[PDB]
Amino acid sequence: SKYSQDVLQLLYKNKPNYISGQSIAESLNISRTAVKKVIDQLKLEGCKIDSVNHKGHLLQQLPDIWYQGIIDQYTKSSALFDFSEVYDSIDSTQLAAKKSLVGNQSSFFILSDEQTKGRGRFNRHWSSSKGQGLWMSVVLRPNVAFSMISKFNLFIALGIRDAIQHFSQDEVKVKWPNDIYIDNGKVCGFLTEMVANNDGIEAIICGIGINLTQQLENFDESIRHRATSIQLHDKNKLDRYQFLERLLQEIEKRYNQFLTLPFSEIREEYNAASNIWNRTLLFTENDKQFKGQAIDLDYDGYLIVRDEAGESHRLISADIDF
Amino acid sequence: SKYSQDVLQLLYKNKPNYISGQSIAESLNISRTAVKKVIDQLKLEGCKIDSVNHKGHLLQQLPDIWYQGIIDQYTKSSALFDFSEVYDSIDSTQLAAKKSLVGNQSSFFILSDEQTKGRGRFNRHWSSSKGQGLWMSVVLRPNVAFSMISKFNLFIALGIRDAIQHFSQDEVKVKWPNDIYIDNGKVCGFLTEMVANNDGIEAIICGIGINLTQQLENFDESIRHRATSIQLHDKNKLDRYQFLERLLQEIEKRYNQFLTLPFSEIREEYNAASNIWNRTLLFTENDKQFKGQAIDLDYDGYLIVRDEAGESHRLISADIDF
Ligand SMILES: Nc1ncnc2c1ncn2[C@@H]1O[C@H](COP(=O)(O)OC(=O)CCCC[C@@H]2SC[C@@H]3NC(=O)N[C@@H]32)[C@@H](O)[C@H]1O
């Protein structure tokens, strides 16, 4: 109802103690029995809430659904984000963020359980199933030249991989410049765009798609082989909210390093994290197609590549297949 | 009314012939006498329309007001623009264009008689009086690396200066990187921004403010000395629609050269057009302030400057005062 998120928030705020119906009612100024309907609705949606006579209610577990009420708890404590927006379904969180950032200097993110026009790099289709992934656009406001887009991307990849790794029993690796893999499975793709002019960057907009709970039967047999989800490498249920916390934690960490460090500092780290060495890569550039080997990432994040004809290239970006 | 622009369009379409009320009525399927009300309203707003018994109506002259109906005539014939949007008042055409470009690949421009939150470079206030200037945001879709923002700006400046010059009896000059001057008066400022990522530019967004009809009494005595309007250098009334045509013509011209030429081609031209040589410039960079002389623009649009201490700098952009 009008009050479902409010109650949800109060329940989450009060962990690991119980609060009575009564206490909630006084808080939102509503009847005890309206409060009982909101709770039955929530349980219906798959919240695990223990209700005990005389004692009240305790939130034990959130379902695979994003709730603004809870997300707002995350934003209030945030040193980075002014606010978030949370949808059940939308055309794309990047479309939404690119609209929201206009006319303001806010730092925010946008989550949605499903996207109906999810898009990746080069405007490829990005499958955004309901209930099954984190589909998020992050807007930040670093004031730094536009050239620095590329460097943002390098720091952020480690942010994302560290948080996925915290949950995967298997090795999570970066595939430069925008993919996160677990073994042979693409578990994430991120897209960093910006709004800028010559005098600088007006906003950065990072779109992050991370697969959380797909079973393989859940990917177009067609990609089933280079796709995977955090769940297929966690022995425990993967809690979507737990994960968001760690992801934000990592993004903040990794975003401050972006503002305070040259790429060389994390270059060796980034290197140990990647999965493009000692194997043959497929490169694509408008029309052209050719093979090569990655031999290094230089102090400036450019990839050094020896193509199939022995020629050397220094790439600030690429699209690479295995 | 509902039909004011429709009638306006038909009137403009039929220049230099007259069309009867009758003929308009059949076209829009409305009464002859509804048509007579629309025309009286237009004349009221300051359209000069000659009405002759038995012969009909001829549009002689548009007032200092933008009309979608007429602007649509400009867009239909356009090899560049999918469409335009035209407001009487709005917060800013750049805010509007940055919103409209999302989720599509359209090339369009946005005009508004007045802006209430006009902004320039570095987010400075940009005075946008009603009736008195062209306040326009141009969205285009060049697919070229993001590094090319700077070069766009160089080609476009000549576009703008050529069209202003066609109307000024006095010498119009560029003040790199974003100003157009007539003698000592800033007559225009333009702002080029973009939306991009590493793989390329999603849109370019050029905000153009050109002063058309201000009398000096019309500028905060405070800038009256480094401000001027096209009108203070045209012996003839300056027609705002005539001017728009020439401006678009120039922008298209100059945008194709942007796609088909290196800066060196127009470098000598650009040079002969600028007004920053042989005089002392004031430079500003966050916090810092210092003097210098422009000695050259290099093949790549970077300004070569000898500062007050004999040191040399190579600037892709700056803010400069006289
Ligand atoms: N769930 C999935 N897992 C692995 N691969 C997928 C996939 N869905 C589609 N693909 C393929 O993986 C590649 C991804 O395309 P790219 O490499 O160009 O580009 C992208 O990888 C990154 C896109 C990030 C998506 C986030 S969702 C939050 C947000 N909102 C947006 O609309 N985008 C973002 C293509 O080959 C796709 O066909």
Ligand SMILES: Nc1ncnc2c1ncn2[C@@H]1O[C@H](COP(=O)(O)OC(=O)CCCC[C@@H]2SC[C@@H]3NC(=O)N[C@@H]32)[C@@H](O)[C@H]1O
């Ligand atoms: N009408 C005017 N003529 C000359 N100077 C002006 C002016 N109005 C304000 N100023 C000053 O001129 C300088 C202009 O600032 P900058 O150099 O940062 O930056 C700008 O020059 C360019 C802005 C272009 C405005 C177009 S209007 C269409 C559109 N929509 C937008 O909101 N912007 C655009 C500052 O010193 C202002 O205080």
